[model samples]
Target: MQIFVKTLTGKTITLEVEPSDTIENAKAKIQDKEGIPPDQQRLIFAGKQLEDGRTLSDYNIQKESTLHLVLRLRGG
Candidate 1:
């Protein structure tokens, strides 16, 4: 299945993913393709926060679903 990933860069990237895989796994792919670490990536789908411990199906995501990604910046 294909998941559409939108970043703060205002660009959308297509990610091939398994519906059975955890959201954490999906974000890992995003990290590799977008050069942002998993922890720094905030993902939302269907206007809700995407959970690392959950699978796409858990979120009721469709095959051509779209997930929004935002880079979480932190300061010590």
Candidate 2:
């Protein structure tokens, strides 16, 4: 399946994934295109964190949905 992504709304990117794809996998793909490392990337959807330890389907992520990207340091 395919979905839309954006570092911000005006600037966006389209990505492809499967029903079983994980958010970690999504981050890797986004890094390939956006040049932002997965560790530096923070993905948010429906106002929640797209956690790497979880799968997209866990969030019911689907076609045409938007995954917003953020760049920040991972702090404890």
Candidate 3:
């Protein structure tokens, strides 16, 4: 399956991963692509946090689905 990832900075990337890919794995890939840490990343699917320890199956992610990884902004 392929997933589309978009960053908060308006950067977008697409990756081809297996359906068994966990959210954590996806986060790592996103971190590598966006130059951000996993702990500092927050993926919002349907207006909710795609927290770690969860799988794409838990989120009902389909093949060729697009997922967005919005970086969490800390205090100014």
Using TM-score as the measure, which candidate wins?
1
Each prediction's whole-model lDDT (CA): 0.80, 0.80, 0.75
User: How many residue pairs clash in all the candidates, one count each?
Assistant: 0, 0, 0
What candidate 1 gets wrong by more than 4 Å, as runs, is: 74-76
In lDDT terms, how accurate is model 1? 0.80
* Candidate 2 local lDDT, residue 61: 83
**Across residues 25-73, which tens digit of lDDT does each residue of candidate 2 receive?**
8878888887888878898887887777778778888878888888896
RMSD to the true structure for each prediction, in A, is 1.9, 2.9, 1.6
What TM-score does model 3 achieve against the real structure? 0.82
TM-score of each: 0.86, 0.83, 0.82
Error of 3 at 38 (Å): 0.3
Candidate 1, position 13, lDDT: 91
Model 2 clashing residue pairs (backbone): none
Residues forming the 10-long window of minimal summed lDDT in candidate 3: 63-72
lDDT of 3 by residue, 1-76 (tens): 4677776667678788775678888878877876789877777886777767768877888767766776666799
Between candidates 1 and 3, the one scoring higher on lDDT is 1
